[PDB]
Amino acid sequence: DFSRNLYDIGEQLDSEDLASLKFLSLDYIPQRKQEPIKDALMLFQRLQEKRMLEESNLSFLKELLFRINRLDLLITYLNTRKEEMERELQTPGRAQISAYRVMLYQISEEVSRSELRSFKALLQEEDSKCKLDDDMNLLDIFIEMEKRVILGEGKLDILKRVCAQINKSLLKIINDYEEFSKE
Amino acid sequence: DFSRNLYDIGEQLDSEDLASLKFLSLDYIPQRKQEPIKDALMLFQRLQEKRMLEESNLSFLKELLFRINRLDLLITYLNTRKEEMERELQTPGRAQISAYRVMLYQISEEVSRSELRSFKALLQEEDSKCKLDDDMNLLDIFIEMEKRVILGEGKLDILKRVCAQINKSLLKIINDYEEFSKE
Numbered sequence: 001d002f003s004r005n006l007y008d009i010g011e012q013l014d015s016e017d018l019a020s021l022k023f024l025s026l027d028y029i030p031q032r033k034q035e036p037i038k039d040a041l042m043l044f045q046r047l048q049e050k051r052m053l054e055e056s057n058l059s060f061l062k063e064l065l066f067r068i069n070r071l072d073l074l075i076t077y078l079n080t081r082k083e084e085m086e087r088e089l090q091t092p093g094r095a096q097i098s099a100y101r102v103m104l105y106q107i108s109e110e111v112s113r114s115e116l117r118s119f120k121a122l123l124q125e126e127d128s129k130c131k132l133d134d135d136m137n138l139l140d141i142f143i144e145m146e147k148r149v150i151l152g153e154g155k156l157d158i159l160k161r162v163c164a165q166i167n168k169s170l171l172k173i174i175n176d177y178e179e180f181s182k183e
Numbered sequence: 184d185f186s187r188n189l190y191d192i193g194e195q196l197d198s199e200d201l202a203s204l205k206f207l208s209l210d211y212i213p214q215r216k217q218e219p220i221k222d223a224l225m226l227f228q229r230l231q232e233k234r235m236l237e238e239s240n241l242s243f244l245k246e247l248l249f250r251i252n253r254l255d256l257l258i259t260y261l262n263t264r265k266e267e268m269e270r271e272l273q274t275p276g277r278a279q280i281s282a283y284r285v286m287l288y289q290i291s292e293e294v295s296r297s298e299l300r301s302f303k304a305l306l307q308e309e310d311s312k313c314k315l316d317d318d319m320n321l322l323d324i325f326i327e328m329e330k331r332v333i334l335g336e337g338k339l340d341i342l343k344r345v346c347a348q349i350n351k352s353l354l355k356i357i358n359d360y361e362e363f364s365k366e
Binding site for chain 1: 195197200252253254255258265295296297
């Protein structure tokens with residue numbers, strides 16, 4: 001039932017969904033170690049092996065599905081409403097995905113086609129060590145930036161200098177994240 | 184095109200942007216003439232009537248947008264890069280906003296939440312004439328301080344005594360400004 005439900009969820013997740021889920025699972029599953037993962041079930045099983053997903057522990061799966069906005073799957077297969085996930089995640093300490101990862105992913109959510117192209121151009125202005133192609137989405141760019149150690153939890157300078165020239169909303173996402181690190 | 188472009192810039196400016204722009208326009212537009220201004224387009228038209236903004240004169244608008252860090256709008260609607268604005272504004276005599284106003288605004292840029300609360304507490308220690316609430320941002324506090332004539336171009340004592348107890352960076356902004364009024 002449980003395994004069958006996990007797999008069931010996996011059948012409804014597409015390639016974009018998978019890419020997003022793997023990006024959001026970076027605090028626990030290293031990016032190197034993600035490219036054997038070819039579908040959502042493999043990701044789920046990798047999470048199972050890390051005891052971050054089991055019959056009595058569905059929290060991380062729910063958080064993942066909520067973050068990538070698959071509310072339909074939450075309802076259908078996990079009988080969980082968005083209101084519940086909101087109440088749960090806003091409570092300090094319950095979120096298992098770091099605020100940094102969520103911040104980057106939300107930026108990726110807000111950026112359009114043309115804004116993505118602008119991001120690439122502006123980044124190519126700001127840095128030359130990043131290897132960029134035009135099939136890359138924003139997440140891939142983030143991964144490349146981290147690979148080049150110009151992006152990290154406490155290094156947002158280039159990210160902000162780029163985003164400020166694209167849309168104030170992105171910069172506000174960063175600024176908000178940056179200031180609830182008051183901790 | 185030009186008017187329609189002005190409105191276009193105006194749509195992207197939020198309440199925070201408006202407040203900042205009105206603060207930075209204080210050398211030309213008196214504070215009591217700013218509260219009929221309900222949006223950015225009204226500010227732009229007020230500038231037009233002072234012939235500080237027209238089709239052949241976009242410098243002040245550019246300086247304003249640059250100062251409040253709307254580089255995205257400069258690029259999108261004014262085809263102007265950060266590099267150009269920096270080169271232009273470092274040039275002696277080119278800036279139309281007084282160094283005093285820019286100094287105060289930069290202080291407002293650097294101050295966080297808790298630093299703002301500290302600012303209010305420390306100012307209430309330093310003075311009893313200022314009427315302060317918890318909805319006031321730092322700009323509003325500056326306006327109140329000027330209204331009470333404890334803050335001005337040649338009166339920074341209270342400002343410095345407060346800022347020294349919050350963060351050395353702020354005090355450095357003040358000191359730098361204060362001594363490049365050497366001439």
